[PDB]
């Protein structure tokens, strides 16, 4: 899990890549719904 994750509402998909990696294991995400949603992992 990423600790540096509060609300990255389109702070940058490439920015959320790291959090998403640290969250799911897969650094593939996009900011939608006002959140960086991961494509699953």
Swiss-Prot record:
Any one of the GO CC terms: extracellular region
Keyword Transferase set for record: no
Record localization: Secreted
Gene3D superfamilies cross-referenced by the UniProt entry: Knottin, scorpion toxin-like
Modified residues annotated as Cysteine amide in this record: 41
Tissue specificity annotation: Expressed by the venom gland.
Gene Ontology molecular function: ion channel inhibitor activity; potassium channel regulator activity; toxin activity
Broad class of where this protein is predominantly found: secreted
Site (described: Basic residue of the functional dyad, critical for activity): 30
InterPro entries, per database record: Scorpion_toxin-like_sf (IPR036574), Scorpion_toxinS_K_inh (IPR001947)
Keywords: Amidation, Calcium-activated potassium channel impairing toxin, Disulfide bond, Ion channel impairing toxin, Neurotoxin, Potassium channel impairing toxin, Secreted, Toxin, Voltage-gated potassium channel impairing toxin
Pfam annotation, one family: Toxin_2
Keyword Secreted among UniProt keywords: yes
Domain comment in the entry: Has the structural arrangement of an alpha-helix connected to a beta-sheet by disulfide bonds (CSalpha/beta).
Family membership: Belongs to the short scorpion toxin superfamily. Potassium channel inhibitor family. Alpha-KTx 06 subfamily.
Function: Blocks voltage-gated potassium channels Kv1.2/KCNA2 (IC(50)=0.12-0.8 nM), KCa3.1/KCNN4 (IC(50)=1-2.2 nM), Shaker B (IC(50)=2.39-80 nM), Kv1.1/KCNA1 (IC(50)=37-45 or no activity, depending on the study), Kv1.3/KCNA3 (IC(50)=150-180 or no activity, depending on the study).
Protein name in UniProt: Potassium channel toxin alpha-KTx 6.2
Source species: Scorpio palmatus (Israeli golden scorpion)
């Amino acid at each position: 899990w990423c600790s540096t994750c509060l609300d990255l509402a389109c702070t940058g998909s490439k920015d959320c890549y790291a959090p998403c990696r640290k969250q799911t294991g897969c650094p593939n995400a996009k900011c939608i719904n006002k959140s960086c949603k991961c494509y699953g992992c």
